[PDB]
Write a structure and sequence with these properties.
This is part of a larger assembly, with 5 copies of chain A.
Chain A lengths: L24 E2 L8 E6 L20 E3 L6 E6 L2 E7 L10 E4 L1
Antiparallel strand pairs in A: 1-2, 2-4, 3-4, 5-6
Bound molecules: 2-acetamido-2-deoxy-beta-D-glucopyranose (6 copies).
Organism (chain D): Severe acute respiratory syndrome coronavirus 2
Protein name (chain D): Spike protein S1
PDB class: viral protein
């Protein structure tokens, strides 16, 4: 095995598993490693383009390297967590708002 | 002989999809509105490119049959030959002069097997020799047409030969054009679907630099530091 | 502009933190991610002030 | 606080149409040669199993 | 159903983001 300075062309195998959508996961689409929900998507790609970016170059839709199916993406949900309350001097009850 | 190529040479620089955006880009390109060499056959000199070559060999009778890339092309360094032989596209990267001189019939490294103006663009960086193409009919067959056409990548090759010279290959028993490519900044505008429809140089002339300080093709009147 | 600032190295090896994670985990990871954090922190602060 | 739904699963997706190169051919072979007249085959540009 | 007034509708029709943000 000689590893010449040029990039190595013959490599080991790629152990690829199944893809599940409508519930966010970490994902590994050949470099694309974000964290979000994948879903079916409609917008059409050209025969060779490989990502989908948008207004500020955020990875925004990707096609599976195995099957020609465009998938849309959205980062996992998240938001503030706050508490409304009557004063401690009038009660102790508490209602919580997820933002 | 020299002529003036209109807005031609653009090509999808990378493999991403943008939509209705106007995207700044920075790479090698053919500077808009430049002075183009014109070799006419039916001749056949040898022309070197440095780091990129706009090779839009035209057509009259479909007679162009290959390319040889390299330095000395005689049993010295491995070099590229790619032939369309009425069947397919065939790539062979050996090193010899005219040992394969059979044309029709009617110690080598890497292999790969795959009116109507055909433009191509080739460039070699980082051990990758990349090709982009576009085939389009022309009606004004007098000269290179006025319009906007966007090329597209066909086949990347991991051969990584070092190349600075090349000549066209014809078949005997049209012509071809060359400029060169230099580093510039363009402003591309991708359409709704994703296929390019216009672009502007940022260094072309006074206005354009403004047009790409705003990153938009509709400047309003006024006054702009650019 | 703020979001665009995530696409810049600020003098580190890359513009993503995951790649530097992959390449080098011991101290040099600190002496690189230091710069990502410093730069991104400025960008946020200089958004807040204006 | 800030609420953060958590990742649940990793997923791997690599080109699984695959190319190969049959090392089995040179092992399941019928063409073996002499010791000093030993051949060197510079093989590459495939996918190889180990 | 939205009781915007008429000239207010003209005004409205005239005038014309999740990497860690939110717009309340
Ligand atoms: C508030 O706290 C004081 C503490 O001495 C208590 O006496 C009072 O009942 C509480 N409620 C109101 C309305 O002041
Ligand atoms: C450049 O283009 C002009 C066309 O105006 C042509 O006359 C000239 O020969 C070309 N080359 C040079 C070196 O000027
Ligand atoms: C590539 O070949 C050219 C001659 O065709 C030579 O001038 C140049 O130095 C070579 N580049 C390398 C990296 O060897
Ligand atoms: C083209 O070349 C390939 C390989 O050299 C050969 O298999 C094929 O028959 C050729 N086609 C013609 C039309 O000569
Ligand atoms: C054999 O190798 C030499 C240099 O290694 C090369 O010049 C020659 O073209 C090769 N012969 C064939 C038939 O490829
Ligand atoms: C988009 O694709 C459709 C094909 O359904 C094509 O007819 C249309 O011209 C393309 N461009 C636009 C702007 O719709």
């Amino acid at each position: 095995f000689e590893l010449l300075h040029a990039p190595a062309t013959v490599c080991g195998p790629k152990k690829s598993t199944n893809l599940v959508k409508n519930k966010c996961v970490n994902f590994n689409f050949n470099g694309l490693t974000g964290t979000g929900v994948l879903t079916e998507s409609n917008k059409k790609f050209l025969p060779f383009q490989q990502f989908g970016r948008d207004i500020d170059d955020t990875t925004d839709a990707v096609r599976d390297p195995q099957t020609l199916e465009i998938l849309d993406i959205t980062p996992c949900s998240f938001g503030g967590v706050s508490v409304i309350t009557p004063g401690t001097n009038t009660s102790n009850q508490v209602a919580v708002l997820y933002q | 002989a020299y002529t003036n190529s209109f807005t031609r040479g653009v090509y999808y620089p990378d493999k991403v999809f943008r939509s209705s955006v106007l995207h700044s880009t920075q790479d090698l390109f053919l500077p808009f509105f430049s002075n183009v060499t014109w070799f006419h056959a039916i001749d056949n000199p040898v022309l070197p490119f440095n780091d990129g070559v706009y090779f839009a060999s035209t057509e009259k009778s479909n007679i162009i049959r290959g390319w040889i890339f390299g330095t000395t092309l005689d049993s010295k360094t491995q070099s590229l030959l790619i032939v369309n032989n009425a069947t397919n596209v065939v790539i062979k990267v050996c090193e010899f002069q005219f040992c394969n001189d059979p044309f029709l019939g009617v110690n080598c490294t890497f292999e790969y097997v795959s009116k109507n103006l055909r433009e191509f663009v080739f460039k070699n960086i980082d051990g990758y020799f990349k090709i982009y193409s576009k085939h389009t009919p022309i009606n004004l067959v007098r000269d290179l047409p006025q319009g906007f056409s966007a090329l597209e990548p066909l086949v990347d090759l991991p051969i990584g030969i070092n190349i600075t010279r090349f000549q066209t290959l014809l078949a005997l028993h049209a012509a071809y054009y060359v400029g060169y490519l230099q580093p510039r900044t363009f402003l591309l505008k991708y359409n709704e679907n994703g296929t390019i429809t216009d672009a502007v140089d940022c260094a072309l002339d006074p206005l354009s630099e403004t047009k790409c300080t705003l990153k938009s093709f509709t400047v309003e009147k006024g006054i702009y530091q650019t | 502009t703020l979001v665009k600032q995530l696409s810049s190295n600020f003098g580190a090896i890359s513009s993503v933190l995951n790649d530097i994670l992959a390449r080098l985990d011991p101290p040099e990871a600190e002496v690189q991610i230091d710069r990502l954090i410093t730069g991104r922190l400025q960008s946020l602060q200089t958004y807040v002030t204006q | 606080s800030n609420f953060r739904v958590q990742p649940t699963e990793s997923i791997v997706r690599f080109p699984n149409i695959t190319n190969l190169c049959p090392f089995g051919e040179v092992f399941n072979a019928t063409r073996f040669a002499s010791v000093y007249a030993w051949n060197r085959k510079r093989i590459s540009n495939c996918v190889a199993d180990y | 159903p939205s009781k915007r007034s008429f000239i207010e509708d003209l005004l409205f029709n005239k005038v014309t983001k999740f990497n860690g943000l939110t717009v309340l």
